[PDB]
Design an enzyme around this catalytic site. Structure first.
Site, short mmCIF file in Angstrom:
data_model
loop_
_atom_site.label_atom_id
_atom_site.label_comp_id
_atom_site.label_asym_id
_atom_site.label_seq_id
_atom_site.Cartn_x
_atom_site.Cartn_y
_atom_site.Cartn_z
N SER B 105 0.82 -1.21 0.00
CA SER B 105 0.00 0.00 0.00
C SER B 105 0.86 1.26 0.00
O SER B 105 1.72 1.42 -0.88
CB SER B 105 -0.96 -0.02 1.19
OG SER B 105 -2.13 0.75 0.90
N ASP B 187 -9.90 -4.55 -4.88
CA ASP B 187 -9.25 -3.86 -3.77
C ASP B 187 -10.26 -2.89 -3.17
O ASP B 187 -10.79 -2.03 -3.88
CB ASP B 187 -8.00 -3.14 -4.30
CG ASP B 187 -7.10 -2.61 -3.20
OD1 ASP B 187 -7.61 -2.12 -2.17
OD2 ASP B 187 -5.86 -2.66 -3.39
N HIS B 224 -7.38 -6.00 -0.64
CA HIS B 224 -6.20 -5.19 -0.45
C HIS B 224 -5.14 -5.95 0.35
O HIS B 224 -3.94 -5.85 0.05
CB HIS B 224 -6.56 -3.89 0.25
CG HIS B 224 -5.39 -2.97 0.41
ND1 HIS B 224 -4.78 -2.36 -0.66
CD2 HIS B 224 -4.71 -2.59 1.51
CE1 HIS B 224 -3.77 -1.63 -0.22
NE2 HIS B 224 -3.71 -1.75 1.10
#
Ligand SMILES: *[C@@H]1O[C@H](CO)[C@@H](O[C@@H]2O[C@H](CO)[C@@H](O)[C@H](O)[C@H]2NC(C)=O)[C@H](O)[C@H]1NC(C)=O
Ligand SMILES: *[C@@H]1O[C@H](CO)[C@@H](O[C@@H]2O[C@H](CO)[C@@H](O)[C@H](O)[C@H]2NC(C)=O)[C@H](O)[C@H]1NC(C)=O
Ligand SMILES: CCCC(=O)OCC(COC(=O)CCC)OC(=O)CCC
Lengths: 317, 317
Positions: B105, B187, B224
């Protein structure tokens, strides 16, 4: 408030009945049922096994729950058919006795949709205990709608949706049975919740509206899942369930109950699952159905959202 | 790309060093380090204990990581100081040998910000393996910004932010070292990711851009966190780290590696923690700092976002 006949269900009774479970009893013969309505991205057991299924059992109830498929992602109006049918069944199955309803997130929106548009169950629910209900939806879902990655019920739970408009205009932002709304300003799923006022998505007029920071202080943090599972939430929920007014009582909780950890009486393994609750729900949402428009309002709700847009176009009278 | 001197750090080196550690080694004397840069709402161990700390150990590395406080929620430009300082330290501490960087991320945005604006480290990183990087930010953070409930780095990770503008205008949407980006259309944190094209937030020009669904099919779902932890992600990451090109190689993976569950070689407990990864991160975010404006760009980045708005006003030349 609508004051006519119940609308017909779009699902057959056999399908609605198959979505209803009671712990150790059939809905047609159940002692002290409590109906648990789960959150988006979950089944009943997934929402509540780590919290209110064992906790309500240990308060003397038979927990029952609905699991509208898939994972509460389809049409909130169909999810509500499961709840209305369940109330009708459990009221009869417990000897024509009112029962409490306890909900998380969308489950509260479902409960209030049912009470608004199916008048027959108003006399069958003695109280509503809603944890982080999104009666106004959430402002956080807007960008997901704009990308067409939103499940039916996520469209409907977006602020400004046709569904939340119809609920509001039909009178559903005022409580219909005695209602307690336990919610938190630090909610990463439902916003806005910060004002401790009628602006909050969980607020009902005449309800017992309990924003956790208003009792525990601005540094108190429970998130969307903590709103359901924390020890503070348990004390408020227990108060609401035990109260002769049908709403939680301020006398029953205070600063010493401001424990953000999962409820004390949960087993160690229930506490682990309670803390993780958002992770499997988020994964179920991401794997579930997706569409580029909000589901149409059913005909009984259309008059209350003229001018909003759904899949078939602009709602007309 | 900027081609001058590294900007001065705003944090003292003692503070930056204190945020860097290696498993069982000092950064000043470490064999085969890999630098792990964590996601928003986490420390290094919280991001990677359940995945790439043990997995990179088994690939023969000494995993090292930074934990910019608080939980990567502060100024992404400060978070990048930790990464740049760490590369400088680990390059020297491994005998002046280039090292890989592996990220989740925001960690990927940080790595690319560092490579863009701190030219001294370009010759010290041999490859970047980024899982679900948000080089363009995410469109999902806008509503939180509008409510002023966003941490510094969440403002900066919002699509359209001054930070993401500066990165792309400085040349940062083109890879600077050999880069593999592994991401997923499903995601729930970083969007848009659905196009398998340069529009995706994880995409870098000339990078090895691996959208999981392009390899594994439209029904393949990793979220995610699954982007970081899945068996598919492990096979791609292993390929990137071993590759003589510095990028993952399509010959090294295929449909039989399309396992969305946590990587096979993780212990049972690691798989449990890997699956739950988003829950503690979300909890840290809601408990962390919040503000009503995007942190100012540091002077070295301002020329690349003239006209964007930050806390002090409109960026000027
Ligand atoms: C979720 O909702 C969709 C849409 O209502 C359901 O799919 C429809 O199912 C009916 C019959 O069951 C079909 O005639 C329609 O063509 C379907 N529509 C679409 C768009 O596929 C779906 O069955 C529901 N899912 C579950 C698990 O109940
Ligand atoms: C996160 O960032 C804020 C803003 O830079 C830091 O707050 C600064 O901290 C010290 C004093 O504690 C001073 O440099 C400034 O006066 C503070 N600024 C503001 C606006 O408060 C904060 O310390 C950072 N948090 C962590 C955990 O490092
Ligand atoms: C920058 C981080 C933002 C964040 O952390 O919140 C996003 C939510 C929304 O995404 C969803 O799908 C809602 C499903 C519940 O995701 C979660 O928080 C759930 C996982 C802990």
């Amino acid at each position: 408030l609508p004051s006519g006949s119940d609308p017909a269900f779009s699902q057959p009774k056999s399908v609605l009945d198959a979505g209803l479970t009671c712990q150790g009893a059939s809905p047609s013969s159940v002692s002290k049922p409590i109906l648990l309505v789960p959150g988006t991205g979950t089944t009943g057991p997934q929402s509540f096994d780590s919290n209110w299924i064992p906790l309500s059992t240990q308060l003397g109830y038979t927990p029952c729950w609905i699991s509208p498929p898939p994972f509460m992602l389809n049409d909130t109006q169909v999810n509500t058919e499961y709840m209305v049918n369940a109330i009708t069944a459990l009221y009869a199955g417990s000897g024509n006795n009112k029962l409490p309803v306890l909900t998380w997130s969308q489950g509260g929106l479902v409960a209030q949709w049912g009470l608004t548009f199916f008048p027959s169950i108003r006399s069958k629910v003695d109280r509503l205990m809603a944890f982080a209900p999104d009666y106004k939806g959430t402002v956080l879902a807007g960008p997901l709608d704009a990308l067409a990655v939103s499940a039916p019920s996520v469209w409907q739970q977006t602020t400004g949706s046709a569904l939340t408009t119809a609920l509001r205009n039909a009178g559903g932002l005022t409580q219909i049975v005695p209602t307690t709304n336990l919610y938190s300003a630090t909610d990463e799923i439902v916003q806005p919740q910060v004002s401790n006022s009628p602006l909050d998505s969980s607020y009902l007029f005449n309800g017992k509206n309990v924003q956790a920071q208003a009792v525990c202080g601005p540094l108190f943090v429970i998130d969307h899942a903590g709103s359901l599972t924390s020890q503070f939430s348990y004390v408020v929920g227990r108060s609401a369930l035990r109260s002769t007014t049908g709403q939680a009582r301020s006398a029953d909780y205070g600063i010493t109950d401001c424990n953000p950890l999962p409820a004390n009486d949960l087993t160690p393994e229930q506490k682990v699952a309670a803390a993780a609750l958002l992770a499997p729900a988020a994964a179920a949402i991401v794997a579930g159905p997706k569409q580029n428009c909000e589901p149409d309002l059913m005909p009984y709700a259309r008059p209350f959202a003229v001018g909003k847009r759904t899949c078939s176009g602009i709602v007309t009278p």
